[PDB]
């Protein structure tokens, strides 16, 4: 009996026929109305296909929804992951309020703080040289072994904060079961000077276990002494019984809690590899930026609340325009893994077909998130954003100042970012193009033949999120904005953003296929569909 | 008066209500009917939502279209890029037929061969040490400076063919105007031992020119002698007048032709950086694999023609299911830039709103191409592919054998690939899930509460493209398959796949914004919309 977000009312808001050029021409307060600031982040949503009526209508839907309650329930540790009967407490990982929070018999404040102190001590011991490898050498390289939630956040953040690397350690990420992943790391590191991290919430993920067994075999091939495992492996998991069973002791294990979703886990001990690159002080700054956004989200009325606006715009488009993707365009090289990271956060959360009650919903839920770094994307796929006939909401991320003094490059980067959003809004008409072609020296027949092909329809929406700089703090804030957008979207759609049951079937079928690949007289092999069977046969013959 | 592909007939084919499980159960020849082989590539399209009637209907549309003629026109150098009045002759770059081909007054066979010999000689001179830097040192590093078509193909192929690197040169790619791109290269190379390549078809791209000016300033800061430019720069372009004007002489310029689209240019001299990594012999093998697919495409009846089938399936889905994206899932780490590369090839080609005649089309054209490497994607966004409610055609790329002897890893990688396509096809029903939950030890109330959340609808389509190995030759074949798919799609939609007029407006607006950023008393600044204006003001204040 949850409020329906995607209803007939939303579908009709579209009939306002918003014309962006016309709104900016006539409304001298358009930017003031449709922008927000949070500390060093400027959120400009003024190039979206909205006016006062449309926005106020969307805000009224949020107000009428359960969102106000759900926000409190998330922060207070209510079991809002309702299919798994778990709290959803990635916010607690970065808390600076110190308000009382007792969940599942644990003092969450004490739990979080204590594990942070342990990670901090580990990083300090390793960087200072007090931790030595088994042959007594100082560690020079860190290898994280993990996949999905146990890989993407650390990998993305270590890249994004490259200018802040300061530990004299090189950090490597092994993830895919494809052994190329492991081998890219092992080919450039020395077993005597490498600390390996097995990062797995479940400690049962096939790829991570295979990779960890292979890494252990490599280490033991070198040392020929099982005691070497003590100086070269640590583990991050919620299943410490399984870590012990693997052969790593509890003093070498760093716990995470069931209420830390993998795709919201970089803030936890899974972030260890981040601290190994940029130091623990910078890790605390990352956390503190996220906290600032948590406080904003929890405390701010919806009309001035950045994640709530982000969520309403996105769900409005995918409802009323029936769009099936969103483009995210980060105009900074350092954010090269940001789209990949948010693909997991967004699509693994909101790619759900049933509501909280288990009923199949008759409205579309999460859409495809894609994009690419600017300005490169301008030369790859912005052609489609400008002249294709697919409706695609666009977010630009701009960074005002970079880490170097090539000011001309930085100015051009930003000019391009702002030009792309301006181009989406304005387009260029047939008459404008035709006149330009004449002025360029084409005759009338040539101008008439070409002009239609150069018309850019325009009136296409964008949001620009401008950061003062890409620091640990501002990056933490930026990621949290999207975490909360995703949350708000799932609440409005009445889905569970925090489970991921859809991946189970593939895991099961993968085990059966491995059996079939090893024994064609097996029941597994006989029960395959013939496409799978013939794919297995084609691999065997090669 | 071109045949309409997306017509009422296509929309009704869907009412066949194909059930994949049922087809495989009842049709013992399903795989034989809906798979093809080309040399070392197995193309299995049997898990697509088709039967004989649907496929034969699609094939009849291709037969009735202008496709047969268009294929000949492309290969023979007809000016099928009709808005620019240019031939489209990326196929000629890899030709092994040696058939006569004279286009725009040039013997294309002589032209292509001669430039290949020049690139081969350059690579050999540099690798052997006969080419020296200005201080007489042997070159150790190559830096490609280019964006889009002048970056992505070389970058993707150099990565994809990493095991075949053999020149003792390290190759770096500078692209974005964001100076982080340039600086990542310059921070790890010595000006005395680095050869820089300015790759730009037009020689007028803002980012590439800024990067090249900055790289030249770096080289001259070191040497303090303009004569050093001769030993440290070469250029690849179609505009040799502009290269001369920049300061590089013609003996240091490597030409490309107007009929080489940027997004189809890695086969030309733009591929120089590929040859610098893997040697010219392996570059010839890459070309030869593409040729094999060209020959297949040109000569094969449509029912047995892999690119034609790929194109018909893709356009059928986006027409009749109104899907707005396609997922591409390469199950090999080496293909980490393959999606990025095909995003340009596909979306920059087919993101068009007007037909050849300039009329706005009333059917959807190119859709969003996205995806990610497997098995990683399984832990990021396959949740949405399995349980979301977005219709998304899926292509899997599988590689039977890798470059190492971790056979257990390779077997698991493939098992996962095949399990994912099997899972898409089958799903798991409520009764199956409920019974599994009981067998796992849940009581009836718990099983009933959870089961709906674990249901995976299934009946979702995929294609699996299996290569024997990822060699220069097989990679060349694979890329060409997609090049021709894109071509066939554009022909059926009656659009020009080979222009890209949509990017022009942003370039123009970027110049005006740069003027506005430097002078707020300018006409440029006064004419801005207020969102752009306030973004510029926020950058200035920081
Ligand atoms: O090679 P150039 O001329 O520098 O152009 C770079 C890229 O920019 C484009 O988007 C055209 O602007 C692509 O088609 C092209 O490959
Ligand atoms: O950290 P783990 O338990 O190894 O799981 C890895 C990833 O796999 C999942 O797709 C679940 O299978 C993600 O939610 C998770 O982050
Ligand atoms: Na409410
Ligand atoms: Na025909």
CSV table of C-alpha atoms in Angstrom, one decimal, chain B residues 78-472:
chain,number,residue,atom,x,y,z
B,78,UNK,CA,31.6,4.7,-54.1
B,79,UNK,CA,31.0,7.9,-52.1
B,80,UNK,CA,28.6,6.4,-49.6
B,81,UNK,CA,29.5,9.0,-46.9
B,82,UNK,CA,27.1,11.1,-48.7
B,83,UNK,CA,27.0,14.2,-46.6
B,84,UNK,CA,30.8,14.7,-46.9
B,85,UNK,CA,31.0,13.3,-50.4
B,86,UNK,CA,33.6,10.7,-49.4
B,87,UNK,CA,34.4,7.1,-49.9
B,88,UNK,CA,34.4,4.8,-46.9
B,89,UNK,CA,37.5,2.6,-47.3
B,90,UNK,CA,38.7,1.4,-44.0
B,91,UNK,CA,38.4,-2.1,-45.7
B,92,UNK,CA,41.1,-1.1,-48.2
B,93,UNK,CA,43.6,-0.5,-45.3
B,94,UNK,CA,43.8,-4.2,-44.7
B,95,UNK,CA,43.2,-5.6,-48.2
B,96,UNK,CA,45.0,-8.8,-49.3
B,97,UNK,CA,43.0,-9.3,-52.6
B,98,UNK,CA,45.0,-6.8,-54.6
B,99,UNK,CA,42.0,-6.3,-57.0
B,100,UNK,CA,42.1,-3.0,-58.9
B,101,UNK,CA,40.9,0.0,-56.9
B,102,UNK,CA,41.3,3.5,-58.2
B,103,UNK,CA,39.5,6.2,-56.1
B,104,UNK,CA,39.8,10.0,-56.3
B,105,UNK,CA,42.7,9.6,-58.7
B,106,UNK,CA,44.7,7.4,-56.5
B,107,UNK,CA,45.6,3.8,-56.9
B,108,UNK,CA,44.4,2.7,-53.4
B,109,UNK,CA,46.4,-0.5,-53.5
B,110,UNK,CA,49.7,1.4,-54.1
B,111,UNK,CA,48.8,4.2,-51.6
B,112,UNK,CA,48.0,1.8,-48.8
B,113,UNK,CA,51.0,-0.4,-49.4
B,114,UNK,CA,53.5,2.5,-49.7
B,115,UNK,CA,52.4,4.0,-46.4
B,116,UNK,CA,52.6,0.6,-44.7
B,117,UNK,CA,56.2,0.3,-45.9
B,118,UNK,CA,56.9,3.7,-44.5
B,119,UNK,CA,55.5,2.8,-41.1
B,120,UNK,CA,57.3,-0.5,-41.1
B,121,UNK,CA,60.6,1.3,-41.9
B,122,UNK,CA,60.1,3.8,-39.1
B,123,UNK,CA,59.3,1.1,-36.5
B,124,UNK,CA,62.3,-0.9,-37.6
B,125,UNK,CA,64.7,2.1,-37.6
B,126,UNK,CA,63.5,3.0,-34.0
B,127,UNK,CA,63.6,-0.5,-32.6
B,128,UNK,CA,67.0,-1.3,-34.1
B,129,UNK,CA,68.5,1.9,-32.8
B,130,UNK,CA,69.2,3.5,-36.1
B,131,UNK,CA,66.8,6.4,-35.2
B,132,UNK,CA,68.4,8.3,-32.3
B,133,UNK,CA,67.2,11.1,-30.2
B,134,UNK,CA,68.9,14.5,-30.6
B,135,UNK,CA,71.6,13.6,-28.0
B,136,UNK,CA,72.3,10.4,-29.9
B,137,UNK,CA,70.5,8.0,-27.5
B,138,UNK,CA,68.3,5.0,-28.5
B,139,UNK,CA,64.6,5.5,-28.1
B,140,UNK,CA,63.0,3.6,-25.2
B,141,UNK,CA,59.5,5.2,-25.0
B,142,UNK,CA,56.8,6.1,-27.5
B,143,UNK,CA,54.1,8.7,-26.6
B,144,UNK,CA,50.9,8.8,-28.8
B,145,UNK,CA,49.1,12.2,-28.6
B,146,UNK,CA,45.6,12.0,-29.9
B,147,UNK,CA,41.9,11.7,-29.0
B,148,UNK,CA,38.9,9.7,-30.0
B,149,UNK,CA,39.7,7.9,-33.2
B,150,UNK,CA,43.4,8.9,-32.9
B,151,UNK,CA,43.6,7.3,-29.4
B,152,UNK,CA,41.1,4.6,-28.6
B,153,UNK,CA,41.9,1.9,-31.2
B,154,UNK,CA,45.7,2.0,-30.6
B,155,UNK,CA,45.2,2.1,-26.8
B,156,UNK,CA,42.7,-0.8,-26.9
B,157,UNK,CA,44.8,-3.0,-29.2
B,158,UNK,CA,48.1,-2.4,-27.4
B,159,UNK,CA,46.3,-3.5,-24.2
B,160,UNK,CA,44.5,-6.4,-25.8
B,161,UNK,CA,47.8,-7.8,-27.4
B,162,UNK,CA,50.0,-7.2,-24.3
B,163,UNK,CA,51.3,-10.8,-24.5
B,164,UNK,CA,52.7,-10.0,-28.0
B,165,UNK,CA,54.7,-6.9,-26.9
B,166,UNK,CA,58.2,-7.5,-28.3
B,167,UNK,CA,60.0,-4.2,-29.2
B,168,UNK,CA,61.5,-3.3,-25.8
B,169,UNK,CA,59.6,0.0,-26.2
B,170,UNK,CA,57.0,1.3,-23.7
B,171,UNK,CA,54.0,2.9,-25.4
B,172,UNK,CA,52.0,5.6,-23.6
B,173,UNK,CA,48.7,7.3,-24.7
B,174,UNK,CA,48.0,11.0,-24.1
B,175,UNK,CA,44.5,12.2,-25.1
B,176,UNK,CA,42.4,14.3,-22.7
B,177,UNK,CA,43.1,18.0,-22.6
B,178,UNK,CA,43.1,17.5,-18.8
B,179,UNK,CA,46.8,17.8,-18.2
B,180,UNK,CA,46.8,14.8,-16.0
B,181,UNK,CA,46.8,12.8,-19.3
B,182,UNK,CA,50.0,14.4,-20.6
B,183,UNK,CA,51.6,14.4,-17.2
B,184,UNK,CA,51.1,10.7,-16.6
B,185,UNK,CA,53.3,10.2,-19.7
B,186,UNK,CA,55.9,12.9,-19.2
B,187,UNK,CA,56.5,12.0,-15.5
B,188,UNK,CA,57.8,8.5,-16.6
B,189,UNK,CA,59.7,9.3,-19.8
B,190,UNK,CA,63.1,11.0,-20.6
B,191,UNK,CA,63.0,13.6,-23.3
B,192,UNK,CA,66.2,12.3,-24.8
B,193,UNK,CA,64.8,8.8,-25.3
B,194,UNK,CA,61.2,9.4,-26.3
B,195,UNK,CA,59.5,9.6,-29.7
B,196,UNK,CA,56.3,11.6,-29.7
B,197,UNK,CA,53.5,11.0,-32.2
B,198,UNK,CA,50.9,13.7,-33.0
B,199,UNK,CA,48.0,11.7,-34.3
B,200,UNK,CA,45.1,13.8,-35.7
B,201,UNK,CA,43.2,13.3,-39.0
B,202,UNK,CA,42.2,17.0,-39.1
B,203,UNK,CA,45.3,18.4,-37.3
B,204,UNK,CA,42.9,20.9,-35.8
B,205,UNK,CA,41.5,19.2,-32.7
B,206,UNK,CA,41.9,21.5,-29.7
B,207,UNK,CA,42.9,18.9,-27.2
B,208,UNK,CA,45.6,17.4,-29.4
B,209,UNK,CA,47.0,20.7,-30.4
B,210,UNK,CA,47.3,21.9,-26.8
B,211,UNK,CA,48.8,18.6,-25.7
B,212,UNK,CA,51.3,18.7,-28.6
B,213,UNK,CA,52.3,22.3,-27.9
B,214,UNK,CA,52.8,21.4,-24.2
B,215,UNK,CA,54.9,18.3,-25.1
B,216,UNK,CA,57.0,20.4,-27.5
B,217,UNK,CA,57.5,23.0,-24.8
B,218,UNK,CA,58.7,20.1,-22.4
B,219,UNK,CA,61.1,18.8,-25.0
B,220,UNK,CA,62.5,22.2,-25.8
B,221,UNK,CA,62.8,23.1,-22.1
B,222,UNK,CA,65.2,20.1,-21.8
B,223,UNK,CA,67.2,20.6,-25.0
B,224,UNK,CA,67.0,24.4,-25.5
B,225,UNK,CA,67.4,23.8,-29.2
B,226,UNK,CA,64.6,23.8,-31.7
B,227,UNK,CA,66.5,21.4,-33.9
B,228,UNK,CA,65.6,18.7,-31.3
B,229,UNK,CA,62.1,18.5,-32.7
B,230,UNK,CA,63.4,16.6,-35.7
B,231,UNK,CA,64.5,13.6,-33.6
B,232,UNK,CA,61.5,13.5,-31.3
B,233,UNK,CA,58.3,14.1,-33.2
B,234,UNK,CA,56.4,12.4,-36.1
B,235,UNK,CA,52.8,13.3,-37.2
B,236,UNK,CA,49.9,11.3,-38.6
B,237,UNK,CA,47.3,13.3,-40.5
B,238,UNK,CA,45.2,13.9,-43.6
B,239,UNK,CA,46.1,17.7,-43.5
B,240,UNK,CA,49.9,17.8,-44.2
B,241,UNK,CA,49.7,21.6,-44.8
B,242,UNK,CA,48.7,22.0,-41.2
B,243,UNK,CA,51.4,19.6,-40.0
B,244,UNK,CA,54.0,21.8,-41.8
B,245,UNK,CA,52.5,24.9,-40.3
B,246,UNK,CA,52.9,23.3,-36.8
B,247,UNK,CA,56.7,22.8,-37.4
B,248,UNK,CA,57.1,19.1,-38.4
B,249,UNK,CA,58.5,18.4,-41.9
B,250,UNK,CA,57.0,16.2,-44.5
B,251,UNK,CA,59.6,13.4,-44.1
B,252,UNK,CA,58.3,13.1,-40.5
B,253,UNK,CA,54.6,13.0,-41.6
B,254,UNK,CA,52.6,9.8,-42.2
B,255,UNK,CA,49.5,10.4,-44.2
B,256,UNK,CA,46.0,9.2,-43.9
B,257,UNK,CA,43.2,9.6,-46.5
B,258,UNK,CA,39.8,11.4,-46.2
B,259,UNK,CA,38.1,8.0,-46.7
B,260,UNK,CA,39.6,6.7,-43.4
B,261,UNK,CA,37.0,7.5,-40.7
B,262,UNK,CA,38.7,8.3,-37.4
B,263,UNK,CA,36.7,5.6,-35.6
B,264,UNK,CA,37.8,3.1,-38.3
B,265,UNK,CA,41.4,4.3,-38.4
B,266,UNK,CA,43.6,1.9,-36.3
B,267,UNK,CA,44.2,-0.1,-39.5
B,268,UNK,CA,45.9,3.0,-41.1
B,269,UNK,CA,49.1,4.7,-40.1
B,270,UNK,CA,47.2,5.7,-36.9
B,271,UNK,CA,48.1,2.1,-35.9
B,272,UNK,CA,51.8,3.1,-35.7
B,273,UNK,CA,51.8,2.9,-31.9
B,274,UNK,CA,50.3,-0.6,-32.2
B,275,UNK,CA,53.3,-1.7,-34.3
B,276,UNK,CA,55.7,0.1,-31.9
B,277,UNK,CA,54.4,-2.2,-29.1
B,278,UNK,CA,53.9,-5.6,-30.9
B,279,UNK,CA,56.1,-5.2,-34.1
B,280,UNK,CA,55.1,-4.8,-37.7
B,281,UNK,CA,54.7,-8.5,-38.4
B,282,UNK,CA,52.0,-8.7,-35.7
B,283,UNK,CA,50.4,-5.5,-37.1
B,284,UNK,CA,50.1,-7.3,-40.5
B,285,UNK,CA,48.5,-10.3,-38.7
B,286,UNK,CA,45.9,-7.9,-37.1
B,287,UNK,CA,45.1,-6.5,-40.6
B,288,UNK,CA,44.9,-10.0,-42.1
B,289,UNK,CA,42.3,-11.1,-39.5
B,290,UNK,CA,40.2,-8.1,-40.4
B,291,UNK,CA,40.6,-9.0,-44.1
B,292,UNK,CA,39.3,-12.5,-43.5
B,293,UNK,CA,36.1,-11.0,-42.1
B,294,UNK,CA,35.9,-8.5,-44.9
B,295,UNK,CA,36.0,-11.4,-47.4
B,296,UNK,CA,33.4,-13.3,-45.4
B,297,UNK,CA,31.1,-10.3,-45.2
B,298,UNK,CA,31.5,-9.4,-48.9
B,299,UNK,CA,31.0,-12.9,-50.3
B,300,UNK,CA,28.6,-14.7,-48.0
B,301,UNK,CA,24.8,-15.0,-48.5
B,302,UNK,CA,23.0,-13.2,-45.7
B,303,UNK,CA,21.6,-16.2,-43.9
B,304,UNK,CA,25.2,-17.4,-43.2
B,305,UNK,CA,26.8,-13.9,-42.8
B,306,UNK,CA,27.8,-13.1,-39.2
B,307,UNK,CA,27.8,-9.3,-39.4
B,308,UNK,CA,24.4,-9.3,-41.1
B,309,UNK,CA,22.9,-11.6,-38.5
B,310,UNK,CA,24.5,-9.4,-35.6
B,311,UNK,CA,22.9,-6.3,-37.2
B,312,UNK,CA,19.5,-7.9,-37.8
B,313,UNK,CA,19.2,-9.2,-34.2
B,314,UNK,CA,20.3,-5.8,-32.7
B,315,UNK,CA,17.9,-3.7,-34.9
B,316,UNK,CA,15.1,-6.2,-34.4
B,317,UNK,CA,15.4,-5.8,-30.6
B,318,UNK,CA,15.7,-2.0,-30.6
B,319,UNK,CA,12.7,-1.8,-33.0
B,320,UNK,CA,10.2,-4.3,-31.6
B,321,UNK,CA,11.1,-4.3,-27.9
B,322,UNK,CA,11.9,-0.6,-27.9
B,323,UNK,CA,15.2,-1.3,-26.1
B,324,UNK,CA,17.6,1.7,-25.8
B,325,UNK,CA,20.8,-0.1,-25.0
B,326,UNK,CA,22.9,-3.2,-25.7
B,327,UNK,CA,25.4,-4.8,-23.2
B,328,UNK,CA,28.8,-6.2,-24.4
B,329,UNK,CA,30.5,-8.4,-21.9
B,330,UNK,CA,34.1,-9.4,-22.8
B,331,UNK,CA,35.3,-12.3,-20.6
B,332,UNK,CA,39.0,-11.5,-20.8
B,333,UNK,CA,41.0,-8.8,-18.9
B,334,UNK,CA,42.9,-8.0,-22.1
B,335,UNK,CA,39.6,-6.6,-23.7
B,336,UNK,CA,39.2,-4.0,-21.0
B,337,UNK,CA,39.1,-1.2,-23.5
B,338,UNK,CA,37.0,-3.1,-26.1
B,339,UNK,CA,33.6,-1.7,-24.9
B,340,UNK,CA,35.1,1.9,-24.9
B,341,UNK,CA,36.4,1.4,-28.4
B,342,UNK,CA,33.1,0.0,-29.8
B,343,UNK,CA,31.2,2.8,-28.1
B,344,UNK,CA,32.8,5.2,-30.5
B,345,UNK,CA,32.5,2.9,-33.5
B,346,UNK,CA,28.8,2.2,-32.8
B,347,UNK,CA,27.3,5.4,-31.2
B,348,UNK,CA,29.3,8.0,-33.2
B,349,UNK,CA,28.3,6.1,-36.4
B,350,UNK,CA,24.6,5.4,-35.8
B,351,UNK,CA,23.5,8.2,-33.3
B,352,UNK,CA,21.8,10.0,-36.1
B,353,UNK,CA,18.3,11.6,-36.3
B,354,UNK,CA,18.0,12.2,-40.1
B,355,UNK,CA,18.1,9.8,-43.1
B,356,UNK,CA,20.4,10.1,-46.2
B,357,UNK,CA,17.9,12.6,-47.7
B,358,UNK,CA,18.0,14.8,-44.6
B,359,UNK,CA,14.5,13.9,-43.3
B,360,UNK,CA,13.9,13.4,-39.6
B,361,UNK,CA,13.2,9.7,-39.1
B,362,UNK,CA,10.2,8.5,-37.1
B,363,UNK,CA,12.0,5.3,-35.9
B,364,UNK,CA,14.7,5.0,-33.3
B,365,UNK,CA,18.3,4.6,-34.7
B,366,UNK,CA,21.5,3.8,-32.7
B,367,UNK,CA,21.2,2.8,-29.1
B,368,UNK,CA,23.6,3.1,-26.2
B,369,UNK,CA,26.4,0.5,-26.2
B,370,UNK,CA,27.8,-0.3,-22.7
B,371,UNK,CA,29.1,-3.3,-20.7
B,372,UNK,CA,32.1,-4.5,-18.9
B,373,UNK,CA,34.7,-7.3,-18.5
B,374,UNK,CA,33.6,-10.6,-17.1
B,375,UNK,CA,33.7,-12.1,-14.5
B,376,UNK,CA,33.9,-8.7,-12.8
B,377,UNK,CA,30.6,-7.5,-14.2
B,378,UNK,CA,28.8,-10.4,-12.5
B,379,UNK,CA,29.6,-8.6,-9.3
B,380,UNK,CA,28.7,-5.1,-10.5
B,381,UNK,CA,25.7,-4.9,-12.8
B,382,UNK,CA,24.6,-8.4,-13.9
B,383,UNK,CA,22.1,-8.2,-11.0
B,384,UNK,CA,20.2,-5.7,-13.2
B,385,UNK,CA,20.6,-8.0,-16.3
B,386,UNK,CA,19.0,-10.8,-14.2
B,387,UNK,CA,16.4,-9.1,-12.1
B,388,UNK,CA,15.9,-5.6,-13.5
B,389,UNK,CA,12.9,-4.8,-15.7
B,390,UNK,CA,14.9,-3.3,-18.6
B,391,UNK,CA,15.1,-5.3,-21.9
B,392,UNK,CA,18.8,-5.4,-22.9
B,393,UNK,CA,20.3,-7.6,-25.6
B,394,UNK,CA,23.6,-9.1,-24.4
B,395,UNK,CA,26.8,-10.2,-26.3
B,396,UNK,CA,29.4,-12.3,-24.5
B,397,UNK,CA,32.9,-12.6,-25.9
B,398,UNK,CA,34.7,-15.7,-24.7
B,399,UNK,CA,38.3,-16.7,-25.4
B,400,UNK,CA,38.9,-20.5,-25.3
B,401,UNK,CA,42.6,-20.4,-24.4
B,402,UNK,CA,44.6,-17.6,-22.7
B,403,UNK,CA,48.3,-16.8,-22.6
B,404,UNK,CA,49.2,-18.7,-19.3
B,405,UNK,CA,49.0,-22.2,-17.8
B,406,UNK,CA,46.6,-21.4,-14.9
B,407,UNK,CA,44.1,-23.8,-16.5
B,408,UNK,CA,41.9,-23.9,-13.5
B,409,UNK,CA,41.4,-20.1,-13.7
B,410,UNK,CA,40.7,-20.3,-17.4
B,411,UNK,CA,38.2,-23.1,-17.0
B,412,UNK,CA,36.4,-21.1,-14.2
B,413,UNK,CA,36.4,-18.0,-16.4
B,414,UNK,CA,34.6,-19.8,-19.2
B,415,UNK,CA,32.3,-21.7,-16.9
B,416,UNK,CA,31.1,-18.4,-15.6
B,417,UNK,CA,30.7,-16.9,-19.1
B,418,UNK,CA,28.5,-19.9,-20.2
B,419,UNK,CA,26.6,-19.9,-16.8
B,420,UNK,CA,25.7,-16.3,-17.2
B,421,UNK,CA,24.1,-16.8,-20.6
B,422,UNK,CA,22.5,-20.0,-19.4
B,423,UNK,CA,21.1,-18.1,-16.4
B,424,UNK,CA,19.7,-15.3,-18.6
B,425,UNK,CA,17.9,-18.0,-20.7
B,426,UNK,CA,16.5,-20.1,-17.9
B,427,UNK,CA,16.0,-18.0,-14.8
B,428,UNK,CA,14.4,-19.7,-11.7
B,429,UNK,CA,10.8,-19.9,-10.9
B,430,UNK,CA,8.9,-19.3,-7.7
B,431,UNK,CA,8.3,-23.0,-7.2
B,432,UNK,CA,11.9,-23.9,-7.8
B,433,UNK,CA,13.1,-21.2,-5.4
B,434,UNK,CA,10.5,-22.0,-2.7
B,435,UNK,CA,11.5,-25.7,-2.8
B,436,UNK,CA,15.2,-24.8,-2.6
B,437,UNK,CA,14.5,-22.6,0.5
B,438,UNK,CA,12.6,-25.4,2.2
B,439,UNK,CA,15.5,-27.8,1.4
B,440,UNK,CA,18.0,-25.2,2.8
B,441,UNK,CA,16.1,-25.4,6.1
B,442,UNK,CA,13.8,-22.3,6.1
B,443,UNK,CA,10.3,-22.8,7.6
B,444,UNK,CA,7.3,-22.2,5.4
B,445,UNK,CA,6.6,-18.7,6.5
B,446,UNK,CA,10.2,-17.7,5.9
B,447,UNK,CA,10.3,-19.5,2.5
B,448,UNK,CA,7.1,-17.8,1.5
B,449,UNK,CA,8.3,-14.3,2.5
B,450,UNK,CA,11.6,-14.6,0.6
B,451,UNK,CA,10.9,-16.7,-2.5
B,452,UNK,CA,9.4,-13.9,-4.7
B,453,UNK,CA,12.6,-11.9,-4.1
B,454,UNK,CA,14.8,-14.7,-5.5
B,455,UNK,CA,12.7,-15.4,-8.6
B,456,UNK,CA,14.7,-14.7,-11.8
B,457,UNK,CA,12.4,-14.3,-14.7
B,458,UNK,CA,14.7,-15.7,-17.4
B,459,UNK,CA,13.9,-15.9,-21.1
B,460,UNK,CA,16.4,-13.1,-21.7
B,461,UNK,CA,18.5,-13.2,-24.9
B,462,UNK,CA,22.2,-13.5,-25.5
B,463,UNK,CA,24.8,-14.1,-28.1
B,464,UNK,CA,28.1,-15.8,-27.3
B,465,UNK,CA,31.1,-15.1,-29.6
B,466,UNK,CA,33.9,-17.6,-28.9
B,467,UNK,CA,37.4,-17.1,-30.1
B,468,UNK,CA,40.0,-19.9,-30.0
B,469,UNK,CA,42.5,-17.4,-28.7
B,470,UNK,CA,43.1,-13.6,-28.5
B,471,UNK,CA,45.8,-13.2,-31.1
B,472,UNK,CA,46.5,-10.3,-33.4
